[PDB]
Structure 1
Amino acid sequence: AKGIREKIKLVSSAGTGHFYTTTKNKRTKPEKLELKKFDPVVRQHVIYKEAKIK
């Protein structure tokens, strides 16, 4: 965002409803380590690849 060891934004589209978000993860530690079940259409918690695909 300006530096290197810094807290960075990863662009986060949903699994079903298109809608995208962002905030905070980190290049300090290993990166292969998340996905999630939440829903920005709120209708059914099912699938979310995150910004990341695990």
Structure 2
Amino acid sequence: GIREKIKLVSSAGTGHFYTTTKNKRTKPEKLELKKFDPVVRQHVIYKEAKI
């Protein structure tokens, strides 16, 4: 209703991304999470970007 779709992008060269949602009002900063990148086959930091 207010909760927007965002994509978390792999900080490695790969263009791999996870997709999730966010309340942009209450949480205006960039969501940042270690996740598994299946292309370099390792856990790497992932950073919000626009869907």
Give TM class, smaller chain.
0.3 to 0.5
Runs (4 or more) in structure 1 with deviation over 4 Å come to 3-15
What count of residue pairs does the alignment treat as equivalent? 51
Identity %: 100
Normalised to the residue count of structure 2, the TM-score between the two structures is 0.32
1:19 and 1:4, CA in 2 relative to 1: closer, same or farther beyond 3 A?
Answer: closer
Q: Which has the higher contact order (CA 8 A, sep 6+)?
A: 2
Higher strand share: 2
Q: CA deviation at 1:6?
A: 8.1
1:43 CA drift (Å): 0.9
What is the RMSD of the two structures over their aligned residues, measured on CA atoms?
4.8
5+ residue gaps, structure 2, are none
Structure 1 gap ranges (5+) = none
